[PDB]
Amino acid sequence: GMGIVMSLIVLAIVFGNVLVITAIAFERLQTVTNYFITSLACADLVMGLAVVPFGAFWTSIDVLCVTASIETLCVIAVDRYFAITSPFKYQSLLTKNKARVIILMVWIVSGLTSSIVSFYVPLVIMVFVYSRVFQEAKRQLQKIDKSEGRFHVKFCLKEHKALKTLGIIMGTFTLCWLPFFIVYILLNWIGYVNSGFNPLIYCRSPDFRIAFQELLCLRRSS
Amino acid sequence: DIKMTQSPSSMYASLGERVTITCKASQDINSYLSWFQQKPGKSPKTLIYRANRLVDGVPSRFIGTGSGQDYSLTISSLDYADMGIYYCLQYDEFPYTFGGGTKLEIKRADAAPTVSIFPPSSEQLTSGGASVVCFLNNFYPKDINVKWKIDGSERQNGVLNSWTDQDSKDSTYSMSSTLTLTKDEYERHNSYTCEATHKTSTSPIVKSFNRNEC
Amino acid sequence: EVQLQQSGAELARPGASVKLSCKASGYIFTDYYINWVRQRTGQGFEWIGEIYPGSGNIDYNERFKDKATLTADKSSSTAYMQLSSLTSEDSAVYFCVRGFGYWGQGTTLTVSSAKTTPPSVYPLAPGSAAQTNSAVTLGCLVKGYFPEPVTVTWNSGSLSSGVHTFPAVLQSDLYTLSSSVTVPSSTWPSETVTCNVAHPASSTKVDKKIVPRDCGC
């Protein structure tokens, strides 16, 4: 009974992560921050077609997936930092072609690989580097001319929700894999829950809402 | 929160002269102050924001100049249209705190009221009651006064008065006083007089009518 | 053509709830915060909250914290204010500003157990054919309506120069008010003159032509 019930969850990891992969590959959605979000899409789709099914070379991929997620979660907090502390535009200095090479390197290193090497370290820095970001993003957020927006006639409040949607996607992966790295099968089941949150929070938070609704023929809010 | 006083409270100035109103806050706002204008029966139109930056479409005769904790709206060469209640506002921090709002009026030349009394419309009498209206129009200064007389005798029971704010063009004051009666109440008397005493004259201006001969 | 439209009049019983809307059109909705300000009758203003349509950041005043809840609609380009468990002291004019730059029309909310009743409009005309001036002043008396407010014009907006409309005065739970208009004696009895009353709280628009008099007197 409960087994067949968990079969619907699988489709969520083969559909919720597909509508994302094909989304990035619209012109407006093609960005570096979204180029690592699609990296986590593959790490989630592979764990949904290779790990979830058989679990409900097989363990080799189970590691490659998870040890690449929390690894890229670190890549994000460091990339977005080089964009806020940046002088020019709210935009990382990582080029499109240099984003692909650091994406390919995330997999190889994640493959040659431990809860301190592939969990602690990448989460330790990922939390502090991002903590530095959310703090600076507040100092700058309201260093803005107060007159701006009420007497009209660059980092702003809109770009401040881009770190909210990224702050929760990074804040959920931790509470879903922390008790696990800290019944043992149930907490290893809580880990698989982060597979249905990515396409969920990417609705009522970012632009993806409009992306997802397009990929599905003018769903409802048209 | 953040108190913001605003002196003066009342102010009578004459056309051509420069009125100046000051607005001080308790905290130190970063010139994040605004000046706006409420006119009787309208929605507040904004004149200035950011301490000195006139809003687009506002006469260049409005001049905001302040810094830190104390600011002030100045209007060189006062125009007739510049009559109302001016408020200041700070938007430096929450919660946004408005000022008390200074009220500005224009001193005119003394003018006697154009009094006129109207008997209960034939339409209302048939309805049920009878309202006797009387208008004391276009007079300065604002302080006016009326007393109702009926059949020589006089009373002030059930009277509903109301004054306007300074007129746009005429820059004057008008009042309306209506004593409301029943059909029966109004039918029981004949003489209905409306006497208005004003600074303009020592002889009270008087209007009246008789329910009968009409 | 910048403007924020509002209801103008909203009646609601005590303990109830109202949802005031503000339809902006004349600029890009998601470029400006919209603020809601409360101004009680003949009193100053008090900031209620400030919702930014673009993002969603809503900042309330501690006072209206658990009272009002702002909400925007990026599509309809209209912003609402949810006001809950209304009380007798909630009655006032609720403004929808485009960030203290362009103030909205204003909605006259009134919390009361009282029922709505449109005004009666009676014409006032010269008494005993007293032609004692180059100009004659008539008027119309809009009596007994609830709640506030009512629009009083003359000749459908045509006549303006020389008209006075007096602020409503509560008399026995019902509002009364008058309007007086002056014209050249060489015009009125000759050319039609009418006063138009409008009471939104009831969707009541009224016109009132002024026949000279009974003659006849």
XYZ file of N, CA and C in Angstrom, chain A residues 69-203:
405
model
N 25.432 17.562 -5.415
C 24.430 18.561 -5.061
C 24.994 19.543 -4.040
N 25.274 19.047 -2.839
C 25.850 19.868 -1.780
C 27.176 20.479 -2.234
N 27.757 19.911 -3.287
C 28.999 20.430 -3.849
C 28.724 21.654 -4.718
N 27.654 21.585 -5.504
C 27.250 22.703 -6.350
C 26.551 23.781 -5.523
N 25.875 23.362 -4.457
C 25.269 24.302 -3.520
C 26.336 25.250 -2.997
N 27.568 24.756 -2.929
C 28.703 25.572 -2.524
C 29.120 26.490 -3.666
N 29.050 25.969 -4.888
C 29.394 26.740 -6.076
C 28.505 27.971 -6.210
N 27.234 27.814 -5.858
C 26.268 28.905 -5.948
C 26.584 30.035 -4.971
N 26.687 29.697 -3.689
C 26.937 30.692 -2.651
C 28.237 31.458 -2.889
N 29.174 30.830 -3.594
C 30.447 31.469 -3.917
C 30.336 32.303 -5.191
N 29.520 31.838 -6.132
C 29.300 32.562 -7.379
C 28.501 33.837 -7.136
N 27.415 33.715 -6.378
C 26.553 34.854 -6.083
C 27.280 35.883 -5.224
N 28.298 35.431 -4.500
C 29.112 36.326 -3.688
C 29.994 37.201 -4.571
N 30.648 36.581 -5.549
C 31.486 37.310 -6.495
C 30.660 38.274 -7.342
N 29.340 38.199 -7.203
C 28.437 39.059 -7.960
C 27.937 40.235 -7.123
N 27.768 40.011 -5.823
C 27.342 41.075 -4.918
C 28.520 41.959 -4.525
N 29.602 41.335 -4.072
C 30.828 42.066 -3.778
C 31.387 42.671 -5.065
N 30.829 42.248 -6.195
C 31.226 42.763 -7.501
C 30.991 44.267 -7.593
N 31.762 44.948 -8.452
C 31.684 46.405 -8.572
C 30.647 46.865 -9.593
N 30.502 46.116 -10.681
C 29.731 46.577 -11.830
C 28.243 46.239 -11.744
N 27.872 45.106 -12.330
C 26.480 44.675 -12.382
C 26.250 43.513 -11.419
N 25.006 43.329 -10.985
C 24.649 42.150 -10.202
C 24.743 40.924 -11.100
N 25.955 40.403 -11.248
C 26.236 39.394 -12.258
C 27.619 38.789 -12.045
N 27.684 37.461 -12.021
C 28.943 36.757 -11.800
C 29.922 36.973 -12.950
N 31.215 36.909 -12.647
C 32.246 37.093 -13.662
C 32.548 35.784 -14.389
N 31.913 34.703 -13.945
C 32.041 33.407 -14.609
C 31.337 33.427 -15.964
N 32.102 33.222 -17.032
C 31.555 33.256 -18.384
C 30.765 31.989 -18.703
N 29.919 32.068 -19.726
C 29.076 30.944 -20.117
C 29.892 29.679 -20.372
N 31.019 29.833 -21.060
C 31.863 28.692 -21.400
C 32.754 28.240 -20.244
N 33.011 29.146 -19.305
C 33.771 28.809 -18.107
C 32.846 28.294 -17.009
N 31.542 28.382 -17.252
C 30.555 27.837 -16.330
C 30.323 26.367 -16.653
N 30.528 26.012 -17.917
C 30.382 24.632 -18.364
C 31.568 23.785 -17.917
N 32.744 24.403 -17.860
C 33.960 23.694 -17.476
C 34.019 23.452 -15.969
N 33.398 24.341 -15.200
C 33.332 24.173 -13.754
C 32.166 23.261 -13.389
N 31.245 23.088 -14.330
C 30.143 22.150 -14.163
C 30.632 20.727 -14.396
N 31.435 20.555 -15.439
C 31.999 19.254 -15.769
C 32.991 18.803 -14.701
N 33.669 19.765 -14.083
C 34.651 19.466 -13.045
C 33.980 19.087 -11.727
N 32.763 19.583 -11.521
C 31.999 19.251 -10.324
C 31.607 17.777 -10.329
N 31.345 17.240 -11.517
C 30.973 15.836 -11.655
C 32.175 14.911 -11.482
N 33.267 15.225 -12.172
C 34.472 14.402 -12.117
C 35.012 14.278 -10.693
N 35.115 15.406 -9.997
C 35.575 15.410 -8.612
C 34.580 14.686 -7.710
N 33.297 14.820 -8.031
C 32.242 14.158 -7.274
C 32.230 12.660 -7.561
N 32.869 12.268 -8.659
C 32.937 10.872 -9.050
C 34.151 10.168 -8.476
N 35.267 10.887 -8.405
C 36.491 10.343 -7.830
C 36.366 10.230 -6.313
N 35.248 10.716 -5.780
C 34.976 10.642 -4.349
C 33.739 9.791 -4.078
N 34.015 10.185 4.650
C 33.872 11.066 3.497
C 32.789 12.114 3.737
N 32.115 12.013 4.879
C 31.073 12.968 5.241
C 31.673 14.303 5.670
N 32.999 14.354 5.737
C 33.703 15.587 6.064
C 34.322 16.181 4.805
N 34.612 15.320 3.837
C 35.216 15.748 2.581
C 34.158 16.156 1.560
N 33.015 15.479 1.590
C 31.971 15.710 0.597
C 30.670 16.243 1.192
N 30.626 16.383 2.513
C 29.444 16.929 3.172
C 29.783 18.110 4.076
N 30.632 17.871 5.070
C 31.009 18.917 6.014
C 31.624 20.120 5.302
N 32.808 19.930 4.729
C 33.516 21.005 4.033
C 32.636 21.804 3.064
N 31.957 21.117 2.130
C 31.160 21.858 1.145
C 29.940 22.540 1.759
N 29.517 22.095 2.939
C 28.394 22.722 3.632
C 28.883 23.788 4.602
N 30.028 23.534 5.224
C 30.632 24.496 6.135
C 30.828 25.842 5.445
N 31.558 25.842 4.334
C 31.829 27.078 3.607
C 30.585 27.612 2.902
N 29.730 26.701 2.451
C 28.507 27.070 1.746
C 27.552 27.884 2.622
N 27.607 27.658 3.931
C 26.731 28.359 4.868
C 27.295 29.717 5.280
N 28.611 29.784 5.455
C 29.262 31.027 5.856
C 29.424 31.993 4.684
N 29.834 31.469 3.534
C 29.977 32.292 2.337
C 28.635 32.895 1.942
N 27.570 32.116 2.106
C 26.228 32.599 1.808
C 25.703 33.521 2.904
N 26.122 33.274 4.140
C 25.748 34.143 5.247
C 26.308 35.539 5.003
N 27.551 35.596 4.536
C 28.188 36.858 4.180
C 27.390 37.572 3.094
N 26.820 36.791 2.181
C 26.053 37.330 1.061
C 24.743 37.980 1.503
N 23.921 37.229 2.229
C 22.629 37.730 2.687
C 22.784 38.972 3.561
N 23.916 39.072 4.251
C 24.187 40.219 5.111
C 24.552 41.456 4.293
N 25.454 41.284 3.331
C 25.852 42.374 2.447
C 24.683 42.792 1.562
N 23.834 41.825 1.227
C 22.664 42.075 0.393
C 21.625 42.916 1.125
N 21.764 43.016 2.443
C 20.872 43.844 3.248
C 21.444 45.249 3.394
N 22.750 45.323 3.631
C 23.442 46.600 3.725
C 23.250 47.392 2.439
N 23.339 46.696 1.311
C 23.205 47.323 0.002
C 21.743 47.535 -0.376
N 20.888 46.605 0.038
C 19.474 46.646 -0.322
C 18.815 47.972 0.036
N 19.150 48.514 1.201
C 18.550 49.774 1.625
C 19.572 50.899 1.763
N 20.708 50.746 1.092
C 21.623 51.861 0.896
C 21.092 52.653 -0.291
N 20.004 52.144 -0.860
C 19.320 52.760 -1.988
C 18.659 54.067 -1.573
N 18.614 55.026 -2.494
C 17.931 56.288 -2.249
C 16.481 56.003 -1.880
N 16.087 56.396 -0.673
C 14.738 56.135 -0.188
C 13.701 56.724 -1.143
N 14.046 57.844 -1.773
C 13.168 58.495 -2.742
C 12.898 57.597 -3.942
N 13.788 56.638 -4.169
C 13.689 55.756 -5.323
C 12.557 54.753 -5.126
N 11.454 54.956 -5.840
C 10.343 54.023 -5.800
C 9.021 54.634 -5.370
N 9.069 55.856 -4.848
C 7.862 56.551 -4.419
C 7.788 57.965 -4.987
N 8.927 58.477 -5.434
C 8.951 59.710 -6.213
C 9.896 59.542 -7.399
N 9.875 58.362 -8.014
C 10.758 58.062 -9.136
C 10.972 59.316 -9.972
N 9.941 59.690 -10.727
C 9.881 60.975 -11.422
C 8.487 61.230 -11.991
N 21.811 46.741 -11.250
C 21.711 47.337 -9.923
C 20.905 46.448 -8.980
N 21.485 46.137 -7.826
C 20.822 45.288 -6.842
C 19.632 46.003 -6.216
N 18.466 45.370 -6.278
C 17.254 45.954 -5.718
C 16.420 44.909 -4.985
N 15.199 45.289 -4.622
C 14.307 44.420 -3.863
C 13.885 43.182 -4.651
N 13.921 43.280 -5.975
C 13.610 42.138 -6.824
C 14.757 41.136 -6.776
N 15.978 41.634 -6.943
C 17.163 40.787 -6.891
C 17.424 40.309 -5.466
N 16.606 40.783 -4.532
C 16.720 40.386 -3.133
C 15.821 39.189 -2.837
N 14.982 38.830 -3.803
C 14.155 37.635 -3.689
C 14.765 36.501 -4.501
N 15.795 36.827 -5.274
C 16.547 35.823 -6.013
C 17.472 35.088 -5.055
N 17.815 35.755 -3.957
C 18.637 35.156 -2.914
C 17.749 34.541 -1.841
N 16.446 34.775 -1.958
C 15.470 34.131 -1.090
C 15.143 32.750 -1.638
N 14.908 32.686 -2.945
C 14.612 31.425 -3.614
C 15.849 30.533 -3.647
N 17.024 31.155 -3.599
C 18.281 30.417 -3.544
C 18.676 30.131 -2.101
N 18.125 30.914 -1.178
C 18.407 30.741 0.234
C 17.606 29.606 0.839
N 16.450 29.325 0.246
C 15.596 28.243 0.718
C 15.945 26.920 0.038
N 16.372 26.988 -1.219
C 16.798 25.793 -1.940
C 18.099 25.273 -1.340
N 18.813 26.164 -0.659
C 20.062 25.819 0.002
C 19.812 25.543 1.481
N 18.668 26.009 1.972
C 18.301 25.831 3.365
C 17.416 24.622 3.596
N 16.970 23.997 2.511
C 16.145 22.797 2.608
C 16.989 21.544 2.404
N 17.977 21.645 1.521
C 18.882 20.539 1.243
C 19.680 20.177 2.488
N 19.846 21.144 3.384
C 20.586 20.916 4.619
C 19.738 20.173 5.650
N 18.493 20.607 5.830
C 17.598 19.968 6.792
C 17.054 18.634 6.291
N 17.398 18.280 5.057
C 16.966 17.013 4.481
C 18.109 16.004 4.453
N 19.329 16.489 4.661
C 20.505 15.627 4.629
C 21.412 15.826 5.842
N 20.991 16.673 6.777
C 21.756 16.880 8.003
C 21.513 15.761 9.014
N 20.236 15.489 9.338
C 19.935 14.388 10.259
C 20.469 13.057 9.736
N 20.625 12.952 8.420
C 21.156 11.744 7.799
C 22.656 11.606 8.046
N 23.391 12.696 7.839
C 24.837 12.693 8.040
C 25.205 12.806 9.516
N 24.233 13.177 10.341
C 24.444 13.261 11.781
C 24.366 11.882 12.429
N 14.822 3.705 11.413
C 14.995 5.148 11.530
C 16.053 5.655 10.553
N 17.153 4.918 10.443
C 18.241 5.288 9.543
C 17.789 5.274 8.085
N 16.820 4.418 7.777
C 16.268 4.337 6.430
C 15.228 5.430 6.192
N 14.607 5.902 7.270
C 13.604 6.958 7.178
C 14.258 8.321 6.973
N 15.429 8.507 7.576
C 16.194 9.735 7.398
C 16.894 9.721 6.045
N 17.188 8.521 5.552
C 17.695 8.358 4.196
C 16.534 8.475 3.217
N 15.326 8.543 3.766
C 14.121 8.742 2.974
C 13.766 10.224 2.964
N 14.163 10.925 4.024
C 13.997 12.371 4.098
C 14.935 13.042 3.102
N 16.053 12.382 2.822
C 17.010 12.879 1.853
C 16.421 12.937 0.458
N 15.595 11.951 0.125
C 14.969 11.888 -1.192
C 13.855 12.924 -1.339
N 13.550 13.622 -0.248
C 12.490 14.625 -0.254
C 12.939 15.914 -0.942
N 14.245 16.166 -0.936
C 14.793 17.351 -1.586
C 14.674 17.262 -3.103
N 14.075 16.177 -3.579
C 13.948 15.933 -5.010
C 12.631 16.474 -5.556
N 11.705 16.783 -4.655
C 10.418 17.324 -5.045
C 10.219 18.745 -4.558
N 11.293 19.358 -4.072
C 11.225 20.719 -3.551
C 11.758 21.739 -4.555
N 12.725 21.320 -5.365
C 13.341 22.205 -6.351
C 12.343 22.847 -7.318
N 11.501 22.030 -7.973
C 10.513 22.569 -8.909
C 9.309 23.170 -8.190
N 9.242 22.979 -6.876
C 8.125 23.483 -6.085
C 8.359 24.927 -5.655
N 9.503 25.171 -5.023
C 9.862 26.510 -4.572
C 10.179 27.420 -5.754
N 10.487 26.816 -6.897
C 10.803 27.577 -8.101
C 9.538 28.063 -8.804
N 8.413 28.008 -8.101
C 7.149 28.498 -8.641
C 6.781 29.842 -8.021
